[PDB]
Amino acid sequence: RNDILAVADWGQKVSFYQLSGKQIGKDRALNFDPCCISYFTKGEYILLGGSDKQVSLFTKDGVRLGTVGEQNSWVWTCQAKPDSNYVVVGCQDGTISFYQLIFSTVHGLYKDRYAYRDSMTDVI
């Protein structure tokens, strides 16, 4: 079985474990206590919030991609809309924020060749 469990510890790390108990890769050191780990619709990106008063987007491997929102308290939950780029962030202050994530097209073209950005970390 090829299943991945993303784990957000309070030792400030995120791990990825297989169903057999073996780990996938190394840990990803964090400088904040995580309180919410989730996924997008097709499981392509990861949402991470917590002790940092902000929400971050990560690759499915755990490489940080950018900041979704900057909040004023701990983000206790960082879910995402079931079939869209919208994300909703609820924090301890009681604030609920509904962001729409927009991804910029990064590409170049020369005559008969066209390079573009795929999966936010690859060049096709």
Binding site: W10, D33, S51, S73, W74, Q92
Partner: protein
């Protein structure tokens, strides 16, 4: 250790009024007199002098720390937390003990997340500072739900 002589001398000093040239000497004198009073358990007049010093200067870290200790003695956890937070901010978080007291006061006031934040700040400042992982951070973590 000529403490009574110092107490009488500072009683005399506090009688004179503050001036624009010896402000720091005045603040040191008032702080030492507050020290003597707190040692002698004269909380009221020490509080009065500390309020005086804070009136004449709004960023005296030691005065705020003394006020936090006084409010702790009366279990004024909200006021003690505010004073300790102010002292922690103005000291540029170079005194781990102040952070310890402040996190403890948040913990007692049932403000667990702020206590955890201050504990993280202290441990980042000093990873080896003991008695904070268990006496404060662990207890705050256990009380979240």
């Amino acid at each position: 250790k000529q403490t009574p002589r110092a107490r009488n001398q500072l009683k005399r000093i506090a009688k004179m009024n503050w001036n624009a040239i010896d402000a720091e000497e005045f603040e040191k004198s008032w702080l030492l007199l507050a020290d003597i009073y707190i040692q002698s358990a004269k909380y009221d007049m020490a509080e009065d002098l500390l309020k005086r010093c804070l009136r004449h200067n709004r960023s005296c870290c030691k005065a705020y720390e003394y006020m936090g200790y006084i409010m702790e003695k009366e279990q004024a956890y909200t006021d003690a937390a505010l004073n300790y937070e102010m002292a922690w901010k103005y000291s540029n978080r170079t005194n781990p003990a102040v952070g310890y007291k402040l996190a403890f006061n948040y913990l007692k006031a049932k403000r667990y997340v702020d206590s955890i934040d201050i504990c993280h700040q202290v441990l980042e400042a000093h990873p080896t500072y003991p008695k904070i992982r268990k006496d404060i951070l662990d207890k705050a973590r256990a009380s979240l739900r």
